[PDB]
Amino acid sequence: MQLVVLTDVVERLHKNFESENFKIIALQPNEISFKYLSNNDEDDKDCTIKISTNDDSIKNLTVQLSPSNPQHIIQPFLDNSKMDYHFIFSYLQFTSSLFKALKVILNERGGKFHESGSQYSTMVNIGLHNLNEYQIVYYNPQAGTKITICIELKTVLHNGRDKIQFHIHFADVAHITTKSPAYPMMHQVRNQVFIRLGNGVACDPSEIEPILMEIHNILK
Amino acid sequence: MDSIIPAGVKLDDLQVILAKNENETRDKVCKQINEARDEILPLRLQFNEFIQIMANIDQEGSKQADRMAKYLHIRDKILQLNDRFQTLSSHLEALQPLFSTVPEYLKTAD
Amino acid sequence: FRKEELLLKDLEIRKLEISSRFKHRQEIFKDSPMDLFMSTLGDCLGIKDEEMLTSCTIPKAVVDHINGSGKRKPTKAAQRARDQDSIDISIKDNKLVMKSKFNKSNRSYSI
Amino acid sequence: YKNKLTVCFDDILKVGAEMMMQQQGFSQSQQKLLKEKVKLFHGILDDLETSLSQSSSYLETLTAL
Amino acid sequence: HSLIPVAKWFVKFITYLTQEILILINDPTNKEYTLVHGIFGAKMSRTLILSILNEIKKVTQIVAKFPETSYPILNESSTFLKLVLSESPVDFEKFETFLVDVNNKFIALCEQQPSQEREFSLLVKAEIPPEYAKVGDFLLQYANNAVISHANAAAVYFADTSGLKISNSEFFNPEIFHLLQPLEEGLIIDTDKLPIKNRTSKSFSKLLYDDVTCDKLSVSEISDGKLKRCSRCGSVTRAGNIISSDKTIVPTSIQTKRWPTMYTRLCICSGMLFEMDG
Numbered sequence: 039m040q041l042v043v044l045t046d047v048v049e050r051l052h053k054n055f056e057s058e059n060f061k062i063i064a065l066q067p068n069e070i071s072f073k074y075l076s077n078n079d080e081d082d083k084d085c086t087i088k089i090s091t092n093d094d095s096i097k098n099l100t101v102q103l104s105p106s107n108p109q110h111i112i113q114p115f116l117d118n119s120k121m122d123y124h125f126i127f128s129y130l131q132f133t134s135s136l137f138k139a140l141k142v143i144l145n146e147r148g149g150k151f152h153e154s155g156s157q158y159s160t161m162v163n164i165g166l167h168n169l170n171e172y173q174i175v176y177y178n179p180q181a182g183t184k185i186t187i188c189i190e191l192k193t194v195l196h197n198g199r200d201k202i203q204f205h206i207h208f209a210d211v212a213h214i215t216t217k218s219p220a221y222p223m224m225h226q227v228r229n230q231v232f233i234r235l236g237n238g239v240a241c242d243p244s245e246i247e248p249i250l251m252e253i254h255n256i257l258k
Numbered sequence: 259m260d261s262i263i264p265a266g267v268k269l270d271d272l273q274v275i276l277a278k279n280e281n282e283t284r285d286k287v288c289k290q291i292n293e294a295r296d297e298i299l300p301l302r303l304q305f306n307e308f309i310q311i312m313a314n315i316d317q318e319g320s321k322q323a324d325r326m327a328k329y330l331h332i333r334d335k336i337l338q339l340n341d342r343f344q345t346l347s348s349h350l351e352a353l354q355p356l357f358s359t360v361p362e363y364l365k366t367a368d
Numbered sequence: 369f370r371k372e373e374l375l376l377k378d379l380e381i382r383k384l385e386i387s388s389r390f391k392h393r394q395e396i397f398k399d400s401p402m403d404l405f406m407s408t409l410g411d412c413l414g415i416k417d418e419e420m421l422t423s424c425t426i427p428k429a430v431v432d433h434i435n436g437s438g439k440r441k442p443t444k445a446a447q448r449a450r451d452q453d454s455i456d457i458s459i460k461d462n463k464l465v466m467k468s469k470f471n472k473s474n475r476s477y478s479i
Numbered sequence: 480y481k482n483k484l485t486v487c488f489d490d491i492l493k494v495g496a497e498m499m500m501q502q503q504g505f506s507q508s509q510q511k512l513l514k515e516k517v518k519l520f521h522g523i524l525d526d527l528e529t530s531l532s533q534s535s536s537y538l539e540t541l542t543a544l
Numbered sequence: 545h546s547l548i549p550v551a552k553w554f555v556k557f558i559t560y561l562t563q564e565i566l567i568l569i570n571d572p573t574n575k576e577y578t579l580v581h582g583i584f585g586a587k588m589s590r591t592l593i594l595s596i597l598n599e600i601k602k603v604t605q606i607v608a609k610f611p612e613t614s615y616p617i618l619n620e621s622s623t624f625l626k627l628v629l630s631e632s633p634v635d636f637e638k639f640e641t642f643l644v645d646v647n648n649k650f651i652a653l654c655e656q657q658p659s660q661e662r663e664f665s666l667l668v669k670a671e672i673p674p675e676y677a678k679v680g681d682f683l684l685q686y687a688n689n690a691v692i693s694h695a696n697a698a699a700v701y702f703a704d705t706s707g708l709k710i711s712n713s714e715f716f717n718p719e720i721f722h723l724l725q726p727l728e729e730g731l732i733i734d735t736d737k738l739p740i741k742n743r744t745s746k747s748f749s750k751l752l753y754d755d756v757t758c759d760k761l762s763v764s765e766i767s768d769g770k771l772k773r774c775s776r777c778g779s780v781t782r783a784g785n786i787i788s789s790d791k792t793i794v795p796t797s798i799q800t801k802r803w804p805t806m807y808t809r810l811c812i813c814s815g816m817l818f819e820m821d822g
Contacts, residue, residue: 114303118303165525166525167518168306194702195705198706198711198714199706200704233570234570235697237697238701291531294531298524298527329406333406336402347481350480350481357534360534372796380616401489401492401496405496411503479502506631
């Protein structure tokens with residue numbers, strides 16, 4: 039029964055995770071160690087799935103994520119929410135590119151001593167509300183300024199069909215006037231970016247990772 | 259409860275006091291900040307659960323006693339919400355003397 | 369066609385009763401947002417005031433004055449005021465009483 | 480921050496007070512008011528968490544130094 | 545009271561065209577969204593909506609001038625009519641000036657160069673001839689600053705305008721929305737060749753929304769067999785029949801002959817309406 043349910047899970051994943059980075063590292067009766075991201079390490083499991091089997095099927099499929107994997111910040115929300123496993127896999131495949139982009143962003147600041155006295159006053163950390171949105175705010179204690187970038191999952195009607203796209207935009211609180219000392223960089227971002235309707239930027243996940251770096255190119 | 263850090267004492271005197279006693283107060287404040295960090299998340303989780311309950315009020319209701327049970331449950335929920343607010347207020351006021359040195363240090367370093 | 373006339377009259381009486389109800393409620397329990405929320409929500413359900421529970425205790429001065437049966441006699445002006453109001457209001461043992469004056473049946477307030 | 484957490488949970492009931500007042504459909508103004516109230520509650524919770532983390536880190540660095 | 549469900553589709557319609565304005569600005573080379581050009585190009589439609597907005601103002605002014613006073617409980621329908629107009633995501637006055645300015649600009653262009661095919665193009669072709677490529681650029685640039693400046697840009701883009709029943713793909717069920725036989729065999733198809741689940745008129749179309757009063761169809765109205773289908777456009781409507789008490793202002797057994805009785809035998813597209821088989 040354990041093997042049959044594992045085979046069913048693997049078949050469903052193959053149906054839902056058709057990507058060139060999908061691979062299984064270690065197979066265990068009680069846990070799953072498979073790699074679906076672009077991590078170079080062979081034995082590092084990007085996603086860990088614990089197997090809790092019952093007389094007929096798996097009781098619960100708990101998703102565990104490696105600390106090196108940037109996706110570990112969503113672990114408590116996955117743990118406390120009993121959502122469909124297929125839906126969880128769909129969300130993971132839909133947001134893997136976003137996770138890679140934010141991994142690059144956080145590793146830019148997380149680099150070790152490069153023998154440069156460029157002690158930047160801006161620190162990048164991830165703000166979290168729920169599974170529907172992921173938020174990034176730039177902490178500057180020296181200048182006393184904030185740079186909030188919210189990424190929500192909003193549905194938009196497209197050719198008689200509703201689609202979900204990443205809504206990368208500045209919050210409605212960001213009605214920053216020209217008088218702010220840090221306003222130059224928000225204004226530059228607005229001028230050079232603001233599918234753009236003036237405030238929001240809806241993007242295809244297959245194309246979020248270059249455009250976000252285009253936003254991050256100004257940031258870096 | 260216990261006032262390890264006296265009120266009105268200067269920062270340097272607190273440094274001298276902290277330098278000794280083998281860091282029992284350091285252990286206590288580390289435990290307090292750890293439990294505050296481990297309490298931050300469950301408050302968010304249960305608050306989202308309360309929002310979900312409120313939004314789904316028009317579902318799974320067919321008997322009047324069901325409303326009695328559900329609304330007694332929610333009133334109890336906000337009961338432990340106010341209790342947890344009081345507990346976190348106590349936690350922050352316990353660390354209030356410790357945080358009181360930060361404004362003085364910042365203004366002296368200015 | 370007296371049926372529709374009495375339905376509409378009952379609806380107007382209900383809306384004015386609800387108006388007096390919330391204008392009195394917002395001031396009697398102004399100090400407790402919890403109590404106001406649970407009271408108005410239970411009355412939206414249709415719960416009689418004698419069954420629901422209160423976390424806080426109200427002062428006894430308002431209870432003594434609203435009835436006047438104590439040492440201080442009720443004011444004749446207060447009598448006229450309570451006559452002109454559409455709802456008979458009184459508190460018995462830290463709980464008020466609410467009863468419809470036209471329909472004695474179990475008027476369900478549920479939505 | 481002590482007053483903000485108290486008023487925010489008092490205001491979410493206050494924001495709803497007019498919402499069930501009409502109940503005693505839904506107005507879009509009240510719905511967006513509730514949305515901004517809950518999102519600002521989450522934001523101030525995150526800000527307080529960040530402030531606590533920064534204060535803690537200052538605590539260890541000053542104790543070490 | 546019965547006009548309220550119609551007004552919901554009336555507001556839901558004007559939002560779809562305004563939504564396409566924002567989309568077309570970013571990518572003007574998309575040929576799949578050329579319908580937006582023809583709608584504004586139609587000359588009587590701009591006047592027709594203005595007349596609708598005129599009588600809407602007249603009705604509201606008359607209702608304000610002559611409100612219901614004997615029974616306050618009956619004022620809900622009158623009050624709701626005022627509320628739905630004010631609570632609309634886009635102001636009607638700003639949208640009223642939008643179509644008015646288009647008419648004047650499209651009249652002076654006729655005097656600049658005489659042409660009669662443009663009248664056909666703006667009404668039927670829903671396209672602009674290549675010789676008038678400069679005219680197409682004017683629609684994209686001017687529409688942004690005219691009305692959108694007074695509305696919420698973020699809200700209209702994400703607004704739920706789906707279910708308008710405009711395209712044919714969302715009229716018939718997806719099982720049968722395809723060619724079934726080769727052109728050699730002809731265009732008319734015998735019923736016996738249809739799929740077993742698709743051999744009844746009930747499975748031909750989406751029986752979810754109404755087409756005359758623009759109201760949602762409940763389970764009771766679906767199952768009573770008193771609804772009608774148009775043999776021409778596939779529309780489904782329960783017009784010409786007494787409405788249930790739950791759809792009235794107050795639940796009652798009084799039977800009232802409502803305006804749907806105009807379309808008892810003739811559909812909206814001049815087609816015939818027949819009792820839907822169960």
